[PDB]
Every structure is written in structure tokens, then in C-alpha cells.
Design a binder for these strands. Sequence first.
RNA 1: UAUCUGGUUGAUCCUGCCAGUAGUCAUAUGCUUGUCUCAAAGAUUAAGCCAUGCAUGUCUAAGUAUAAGCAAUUUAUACAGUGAAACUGCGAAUGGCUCAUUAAAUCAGUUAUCGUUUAUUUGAUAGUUCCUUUACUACAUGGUAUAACUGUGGUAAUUCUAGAGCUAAUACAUGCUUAAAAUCUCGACCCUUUGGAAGAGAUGUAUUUAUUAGAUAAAAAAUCAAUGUCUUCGGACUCUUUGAUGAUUCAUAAUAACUUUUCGAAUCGCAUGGCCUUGUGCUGGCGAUGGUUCAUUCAAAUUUCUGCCCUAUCAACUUUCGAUGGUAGGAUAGUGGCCUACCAUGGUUUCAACGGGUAACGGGGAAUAAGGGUUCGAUUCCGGAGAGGGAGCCUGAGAAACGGCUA
RNA 2: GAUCCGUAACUUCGGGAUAAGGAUUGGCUCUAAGGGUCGGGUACGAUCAACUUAGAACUGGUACGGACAAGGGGAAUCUG
Lengths: 155, 188, 167, 260
Amino acid sequence: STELTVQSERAFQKQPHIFNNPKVKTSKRTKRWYKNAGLGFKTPKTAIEGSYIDKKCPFTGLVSIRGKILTGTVVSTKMHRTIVIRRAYLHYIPKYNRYEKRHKNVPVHVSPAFRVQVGDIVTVGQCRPISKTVRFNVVKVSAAAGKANKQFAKF
Amino acid sequence: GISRDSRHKRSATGAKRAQFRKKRKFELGRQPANTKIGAKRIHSVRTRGGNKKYRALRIETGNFSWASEGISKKTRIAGVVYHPSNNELVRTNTLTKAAIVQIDATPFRQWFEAHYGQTLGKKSKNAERKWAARAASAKIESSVESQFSAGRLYACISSRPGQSGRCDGYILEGEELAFYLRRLTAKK
Amino acid sequence: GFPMKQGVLLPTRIKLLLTKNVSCYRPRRDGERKRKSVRGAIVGPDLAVLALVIVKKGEQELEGLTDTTVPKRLGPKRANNIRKFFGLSKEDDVRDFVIRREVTKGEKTYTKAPKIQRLVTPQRLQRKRHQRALKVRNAQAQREAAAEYAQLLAKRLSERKAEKAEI
Amino acid sequence: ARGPKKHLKRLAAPHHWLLDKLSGCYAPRPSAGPHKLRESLPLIVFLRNRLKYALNGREVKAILMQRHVKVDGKVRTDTTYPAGFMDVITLDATNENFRLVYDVKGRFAVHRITDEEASYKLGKVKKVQLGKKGVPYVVTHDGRTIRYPDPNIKVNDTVKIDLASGKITDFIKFDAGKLVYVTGGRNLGRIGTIVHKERHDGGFDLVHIKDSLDNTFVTRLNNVFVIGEQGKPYISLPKGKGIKLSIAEERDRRRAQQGL
RNA sequence: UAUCUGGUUGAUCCUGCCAGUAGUCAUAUGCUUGUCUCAAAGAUUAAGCCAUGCAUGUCUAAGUAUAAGCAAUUUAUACAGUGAAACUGCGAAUGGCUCAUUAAAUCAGUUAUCGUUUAUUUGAUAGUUCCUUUACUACAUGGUAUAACUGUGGUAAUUCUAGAGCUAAUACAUGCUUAAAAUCUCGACCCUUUGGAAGAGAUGUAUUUAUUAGAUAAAAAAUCAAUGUCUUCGGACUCUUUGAUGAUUCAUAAUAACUUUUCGAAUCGCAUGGCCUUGUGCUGGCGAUGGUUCAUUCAAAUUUCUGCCCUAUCAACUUUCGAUGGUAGGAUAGUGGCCUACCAUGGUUUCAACGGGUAACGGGGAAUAAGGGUUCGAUUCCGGAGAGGGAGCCUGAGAAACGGCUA
RNA sequence: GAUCCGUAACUUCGGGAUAAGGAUUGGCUCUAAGGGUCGGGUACGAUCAACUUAGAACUGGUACGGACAAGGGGAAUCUG
């Protein structure tokens, strides 16, 4: 998201130790740093052509994706730059020889490289503790609209 | 003492954590530096593993780096002009990281007149070939040149003075300078 | 029996948290501080003993303050503490100007002199020689091993152009 | 609990030490050293429980203070010194040289080596890096830092180490078709020569290995040690050569050797 | 090791419980008690209270020996053997005990640190230290300031101690010597060009900041800002050097400086040999301690996933005075609302949140033997927590320590 | 007085209730938020004018609704 007007905070939002020189007259007007996150996750074109900063991005920020790689379905995109996904699974009760449905809500951080809404399947990767509860970071969006644009008006 | 654990601090369900173990030495916190300007005072705090930290408080000289010229000079600090976290640290002149200060503009001016010789604002043999080779390195800026007229440059702190005992920074240039100038002008 | 402490104030008792290297307290543990009773430094009526140091002797002799000189128990031990003690101008072979104390094994009189500490001997010179030697030999050996590593890199750089030249 | 631990109790000791269950509350906690807790051997355990030269731990220290046993050339007079895999233990008295190498049942073996094989050991290079001032260095599986190696030495290779000089004389790469000693896991002590390395980017690569009865098995990389080419090893192998006959073949092997 | 029997009726067949029966590494208690091996034991209730004693100290050839201590002999008039005391180093943060708290907490299996500290051990690792570089600065080696000790004392009392006089160091505070170069900056001069030149400084490591390099996706060109090697003076430039990971602003290097400037051996025992300019000249072995940085080990701190008993006569909880998230700062060993400022209104929940109870420390395990289960786990191992209840802290690598301190 | 917190039995569910019970309050110097009008072919800037609320530092013989003004409260019984 990030709601462009990117310099929206009281500090100047910049990437650390990325210098773009005022003397050398570069006709791209800003240097950007972006990285490959590893594990075959393709860095999106919104992370290279984007002009946000987002120091917890998996591609343009200082976090590294290492540990578990989970997936989930998105149930809350109301916080700024962090969503909450649902992760449902089955718990085997060994006495009754059968299962029960369980779920867990995981809050993950979502870069402004992706646009996520409620219902989309995301793949997230474990990173360092981002906030009090955020330990994961969106590395793949596996849905775009979940058939939203295919519901227009009549003829 | 100060703790920095999450053994207090209600869980994500909003439940109050029951009180587990007594306060731990390895979850310690300490009091802020609140560095002022003038009359260098630095105390040493014994951290974990020995490994002393240098709690600066009231320091006055810094090592500021003119980034587009490649140099670093030791200069005075005049005062804190802007702070993105708290305006109180602007009011009481407390130096932390990311503060915006006014430094000295004298050794950078003297270096620029030794390196290019152009008298910001407004003889012998080898520096003649030198100042031939430059110039196309001496067209610096409008907005950074015009501060040298005032005898004070805007700068940012980049060292954490409470942990390092230094107030080192760089000099504001380009869009960062335009951003902080838009901040400083439209509050006065 | 509470001892007086220099410059507390205040002629009554007070409980201070005494620390290491501080009078009126000896610590039984490293870093341990202990809160103890201490009378301050102004003389009053509660004192059973004053302690006076004669800075100037008066006209009439006391019993055993002036008339007896108790000797010093030990003499100087370090080399320069003996050279200072006699004014020796450091050539003067301080091994001979040591103080010897004679003791009696009943009917046979032995004598002991202490030890000269920080005294230059052949052993100290030999050890200094070995340390200055090992620094130089070590630096030379690392420079040589760096040189052979550069030789190894060179014979792989002539080698990694050869397989580009035969294709 | 407030700091490092110093006592290792019996029944918490590693099981391949074969310390007796009764008769002792404690077990020798190996010192800090080149190897770890669960993959080493104190010298008291070697000189008393394996070699039976000492009857006590008092006699083990009585031995070790006469400078007799020396591990990897250096004298090493610590009672619970953690001698580990690939170590050369030189007894100058009795003219004996042992190499700590793994049994097929997973135990440290009493394996005598000859006096020329005692002048090198093998080190699996655990990390290669650039040290200060741009000096490359290898770190083997027993903590040795060896500066200026060959640039062809990469990680998971093995290296021959000369044990008087700390230097390298030869190295074997990790390749499909090269002999393997397995050090850890369910297949600790097995041997032989490789099938295929499964990559698994993201953690815990696997190696498929096939001994000389064509019994293929799978281990992780951290248990895999290279010890030479197919056939020819670089070291003396223990008895049994890392085969792991099953329990039926084992009892049929023992009931063959029963004629007195 | 897949078992049933007695009791409702005048008698019958049922549902159904009561009672019997068998075990208990499950406690108590009664009667009884000859032998061998094995051996739990103040858990339940009072994590209630404690007299007394003990449980943590430590010295090798190798830190400090003038004990006015002992042994006196055998080369020692500085010492040189044994060795109390005390200084110094180290440990005392291990062990041992208990189970009060504690219900997503602890813990178990599994992960991560590209998010950190680490004494010790183990392996590597430091020629640069001073000074506008001919009248220089101890390096054959620098300064006081104490302990034990002697002597004078105080108090009813103690692991209480004051005053006075000596004297050590691997304690404390200081301070030098080491190559030759390469590369940078500046440059006394002239000579006018496509300029070319002595010599002055800097140049370890550590901290802190900023900038740069840290290449690789396969073949060809043109311009502009500076200047570089060979010059057959049009201009060519031919060969150009580079590790790791899945992944980095990584390792590492380079530049400009910065720092109440860290470290770079004024230490110890045995051996005492080799050279000639004979100066008590230069050199010289084994190993003891200590020390910078890295790696390793011993760990630690956080952390991913999944899993806990009963309760709805607990259905809404969280934001009070952080509750969920963003930005910036502080703090930390470090990530992080851990804390502060500004901002946003989020976060959990019938898949049981939140509250309550637990006569609840969790696990490996224990009892019961058709299969499935059911109950127990204070207790020999692992992990956690606590030392009467709370809190605060010194020392240290490591403690929020209680056989440490403060309230 | 005002501001902020916290409020019980009972109830005709409207109340009780300013329940009960607590804290703050000056001066000075700052900070932040809340506005009006003008020109955009078919993202902002100039300028002008308000007292309201919140916060911070400093300060004093701990004082501050500084005079004035300005509820005592609760547990019940009889009764309308």
C-alpha cells in the first residue's frame, strides 16, 4: 500500500547507505537497492520500479527470509503494511481415530510490492521479529482478485 | 531495574500474562544518555561480556562527512534544529541519532578553497594544475552553497551518541536537504 | 569501639554503605559493600581514644616518644628502591648494597638478604632477545607464505587462460 | 541456570561411551576443546574403559602427568580432554598409535594404526572464509584454522593434515563416486562411496550412499565425511569396514566361529 | 493377558445399581517376622519455624617469601630448600535440595540467529607504538602505595577494626625499540610541454561515521567529465583482477577523518649451549603465564511450527498509565511496543477467546495386561522456578546470586 | 467551581447519581490541533481573522476555584 506521497513521515524516508550523488548528473534521479530473497521467490517489478522505502521489505529492505516457509489465506488487511492470515489444519485426536478442524491466525508483514485483499492466498516466509507479533513476511501472492472483476452488471 | 522482556505486556489475545520468573539480568535496560552540547563528558558503562559502552552526555565536537566530496572534518556542533521523533529534543538541544544540526562550515570551506579555490558564496605551481583538473567538481549546489554564506551547514547525526561516545554525521544534500528545508521553513 | 572516619561530618554515629579501598571496612567478598556504623570526624565527649601524631616536638622530652627509635622492619627490595636509598647513579651494582639481616641458629649465625626485583640479569636480556626474535621471524614467515600463495594464484592465472585458448 | 554447567551425570552421558549404569553417580564431562560433547571421547574413557591400562581415574591422571599419551602430536595432559573423530593418539611407551574411528555399531573403536599413518589426519573443511587482511582460511571439523589453502578447496571437502606442520598436503573433493565415512545419525560408522547428493535449497541436503554389498541408505551432509576414492581409502579402515550386517547375519557369523 | 458371582419376586426374564473378586513403583496402619541379594524413605499437611556442628576453597620447576618459622650445609653476601601469613590469579553462577508460583506460560519434538554475548579449552593471529625525523627520549628494563609483619589501641559483643612505622608483584598506574618497500596526499623548482621532479608527511590494530569495490545473462559501437601504460605522435590499449550463500548493505578490501586512543610482553622456571672485532659483546633451546582479532568448544539469550486438565451458574475480552500496527529515537549483548514521541484503529473470539478452578511444575515415564483405553507422574534423567515474602544491586565471561550485599 | 477517574443496594429500567470515594488547578515560556476569501483549459499557494482544547519545560515559603462565589455525605423506619 504505503499511499504514495511516499515521504509522508516526519523523517526522510530513504534506504540506508544508498547514496545517489548530486554532482554526477544521473538521469534516473534516484539510486535503488533491491535483492533476491532466495528460495526461488521472484522479486516483483513493483519492488524495482517502486518508489517506496519500507525497511521491512523482503526485497528492498533489511530483512532476510530464513526458517519456515508457510502459506495461508488472508483474513485481515486493515493494519498498515501488516495483514493477518488464517492457517487452517486438522488435529488428529488419537482416541476417536479421527480429526478436528483447527485454525490459527498469524499476523504477517506485507510489503507494498504486493497488493493483498481479503481472501487471497499468500505464501509467507519466516524472518526476524518485526514487531510484537509479526514474524513473517509476504513473499508470494497466489491470488489476484478471487473472481471479483468477473462480477459486473447485466447486459 | 528496567526490563525489556515480554513477560509483562499482555498477549495478542489481550490476556494478562501471569507473573513468571523474577527480573532477569540479561533482560536489563538502562537510562538514556540525553547528550547535550558543550564540554565533552563521556562515562563508561560495563555491558555484557565486559565490552564497555561509552555513554556520551554533553559532547561538542563531531566528525561530519561531506558525502559528495568524499571528506570528513572534525567540527563544532551549534545546535539541534529538527528531530523527527520529538520536538522537545529540538527545544532542549539533545543530540541523538537522526537529529538535524548546524555544524561549523569553516573547515569544509577551507578545504574547498584548498581543493578548488572558489570562495563559497559571493599561486604556486602544482595547485595550478590541480585547480585545472577540478572545476566540473566545483559546481556543488544552490542550496548547500547558500548555507556557506551563513557560516553554518545543515547536517544529520548518524552515530548513536549514547552507545558510541561519538556524535558523527553527514552533511545534508539533495532531496534529503530539500525535505528538511520544507520541514524547517513551514513551521517558522 | 566505633572508629572515626575522615570527613563524614557530624559528631554522632551514622551508618554508611562502605565499599572497597575505603577505611573502616575490609571486604570478605569481591565487590561486596556493607552498611556499617561509623562515627564522624568531630571530637566530642563520646570518644574513648584520640589518636595524635606529633608533627612538631616540644621543648621537654616525653617518656618513650622521643627517647626511643623503633627501627624499620624491612629494607628496600626493588633495584631502584635501593638505588634511591643510597644515591647510587645507576652503574653501582645494587647487589652489593643490599641490606642483610643476621639471624642466629642458636650457635651458628646465618644471614638473609631479600631479593632484587626488576634487576637486569642475563636471563631478562635473553627473554627480551627471544621475544624480539620471534616477532621478526614470525613476520618473515608470514610474508614468505603470502608470497608462495601469490605464486599459486599466478600459476592458476596462467592456467585459467590456457583453457580459453584451446577451445 | 546462572552460568555454564560443569558436572555431567551418569545416564546423561553419551551412550557410545558405554559407561556402566550402576557404580558411579557422575560421568566425565569432556572439557571444552576441538570436538563437542556428544561426538567425542574423554581420555579417561579411552585409557580406562577401552584400553584398560588404568583401573581408576586416579591412575589416568598418574599416566597423563608423565607426558605419555599425546593426542594429535601435542601432549594434552587433560583427564577429560575431548579426543574425537580422526584423532591420532600416540603412546610413545608401548609404541602404539591409535586412530579414533567409528565402529559399525556406532562406537569409538580401539584401532591401532602404524607409525607412518600416525603422521597425518583428515579434516572435513567446515567453512572456508576470508580472514583479516584478505587471508583465506579453512576450518576443519576439529576447529583447526589453516591459512592460505588451495583455492579449489571448497566446503564439505576433506583435507589431509600433516600434524607436525599444521599445513595441508592433499585434499579430496566431494564428488559422486568417492568414499565416505558416516559420522552421526542412525547410520553412524557405515562406509561407502556415494550414490547422489540431493540439493534441497533452504536447508538439510541429503546424500545417498551405497556400500560394498549394495545396501543404499540416506544421510544428511553433516554426518558425511569423505575418506577417499572408491576402493582405495586414505586411512586405515577399522575391522568390519563399515558394512552393518543385520542381526541374523551377525549371529550366523558368531556361530560359525565357535569351534574350539 | 478376551472369565464373572451374591442381592428387588411366590417364582420368571430384564434394566439397573450396591456388594463381592484381582492388581497398584500406592500411601497409612494392625498382628507377625528366621536367612541371602537388592534399597525408597518429612513429597502430600506447614515453600511452617530452627538450637548446634559441618557442607567452598585453592600453589605448581614455572606470579609475590627477609615468617625476628623450620632444615642447616654445600659452589652461591641479591635470592636460590621446605614453607605459615597476606597480596595477586582463579573458583565460589557448579553441585545439592524443594515443587510454592506457573494453564500457550513452563515443557516436548522441531526450527532460526542474514538478530546476538560468550571466561575457559582448541587452532590460527600483530617488524609500524616517540618525534616538523643533527645536538632526543631510561630499554642493561621506569614510579609510588599498600597487605602480611612490628608497635600502640578502642568495644560487653562479630570473620569489628583505627592510628603509626616498613616492604613486593603477572596487583596498580606508566613507557620505548624493528625491515625494506609500495601507494597516497601535499609539494622546494622550471617550462612552457604529450609537462617532470627531488623530499616532507601519512600509512598496524581497535572504536565511530560517511563513501566505494565486493564482477559473471551470450555478441558489436559513439559521445562527454578527469587522466593512464606502451609510444613507428594517425592514435591503439591487445591479456585485464574477484570468495560464500537459497539469500544480504555478507566475508574482506579501499578512501576521508574521528577517539578523555583499546591492544601491540618492563612477566616466570629450567636448560645453559654456539660465534670473535674479547667487549662479562652479539646470538641461542624447551614451556609457563598473559594479550588483540577470527574460528572452535562449553554455553547462553531470544525464536518458527504443533501439542495441555475441569469450567458458559465465565460470551465477549483487549486499549487504565501499549492494547494491535507504522515511522523515528532511546535502550540492549542484540531483534522487538522493550520504552518514549507522533500517527493509524486495530488485535483475540462458539474451531471456546477472556475470566475462574487446579487438593497443576512440564516431559522421559508409572499402574492397569484382548484391542481401544483409564488413572498417575512432588520424587534418581532432561528442562524450568525458588531460597521466609517482594524489590534493588555490586563483582564477574556468566547472578538480578541469597552457605553475596542493601532496604 | 471546573477537569479527569470511579461509582453501590434498589429500580416503575426512566432513575438513584454531583451517589459514595479520589486526583489536578497559579504565573511564565513554548508546542500541537480545530478556520475565511482568492486565481486552476475543456497537485498546491498567497493572504486574513478567531478563542477553544490538549501537552511540555521552567518557576515559588506546596501555593494556585488563593477575595468573591460555592453540595456535607451515608444505613434505614413511619408516612404522603
